[PDB]
């Protein structure tokens, strides 16, 4: 299937209680592999997946140097943004950054991302062409102007199309047992009376990887989109995911209902009956 590498950066100002918090996490697909936390003892990029632990000291030293440089940039950025919006030093503010690359099933570049939010709102984004910038207000236009003058987009493009794809391929190869695995959903159905005239059918998908899944109920072969309780896909905490979908079935009508499960690990979609 397709694959992604993403980095997620959270920078939070703490006006009274010392330096801004900085958290960095890196993911390949749905698997976290690294973290940095400004408040932690190590002050190092740390491994969070077994397969990256085998990268040697040059790797860890280089990722530590870069994550600290990122951290320092974000520390300045909180001050710059305050200035741009004429905000006081009183309030806590949040800067978020995300960047990375998508490859298709051929492991060739599909798309790149490099984008920011301030206080939960889009600030500036590199557009899909990787040549131009989406700025929604005059603050972001000021960032855009400086970055167009310094040819930032060209430097980001070379990373997103080159380095990002090369390292994602290296990770997919080195972490093959973890990252290229497909865990097909383990499925079950439960039935629970709610009154004397209706019952809940709940269709479960457990222990699957990756997270992408489609879980749908049909009545007489008609999708129940509007009449299905569907929970958000959730982590089990062992690197697998869970989901369920539930329908309220009036008395005697259980046999009208089918649960349909689609996942990369299912050669054929499942149809499940009570």
């Amino acid at each position: 299937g397709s694959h992604s590498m993403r980095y997620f950066f959270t920078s939070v100002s703490r006006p009274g209680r010392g330096e801004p918090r900085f958290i960095a996490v890196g993911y390949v697909d749905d698997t976290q592999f690294v973290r940095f936390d400004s408040d932690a003892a190590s002050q190092r990029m740390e491994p969070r997946a077994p397969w990256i632990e085998q990268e040697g000291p040059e790797y860890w030293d280089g990722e530590t140097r870069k994550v600290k440089a990122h951290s320092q940039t974000h520390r300045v950025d909180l001050g710059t943004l305050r200035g741009y919006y004429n905000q006081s030093e009183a309030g806590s503010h949040t800067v978020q950054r995300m960047y990375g690359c998508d490859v298709g099933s051929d492991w060739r570049f599909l798309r790149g991302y490099h984008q920011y939010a301030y206080d939960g709102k889009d600030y500036i984004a590199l557009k899909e062409d990787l040549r131009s910038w989406t700025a929604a207000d005059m603050a972001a236009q000021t960032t855009k102007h400086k970055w167009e003058a310094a040819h930032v987009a060209e430097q980001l493009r070379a990373y997103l199309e080159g380095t990002c794809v090369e390292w994602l391929r290296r990770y997919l190869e080195n972490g093959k047992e973890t990252l290229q695995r497909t865990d097909a959903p383990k499925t079950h159905m439960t039935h629970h009376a709610v009154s004397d005239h209706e019952a809940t059918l709940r269709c479960w998908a457990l222990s699957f990887y990756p997270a992408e899944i489609t879980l749908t109920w049909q009545r007489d072969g008609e999708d129940q989109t509007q009449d299905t309780e569907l929970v958000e896909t959730r982590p089990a905490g062992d690197g697998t995911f869970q989901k369920w979908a539930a329908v309220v079935v009036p008395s005697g009508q259980e046999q009208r209902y089918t649960c349909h499960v689609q996942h990369e690990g299912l050669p054929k979609p499942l149809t499940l009956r009570w």
Binding site: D77, Y159, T163, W167
Partner: peptide, 9 residues
Amino acid sequence: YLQPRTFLL
């Protein structure tokens, strides 16, 4: 593998 260069807002 992080971006080796950072750019101020």
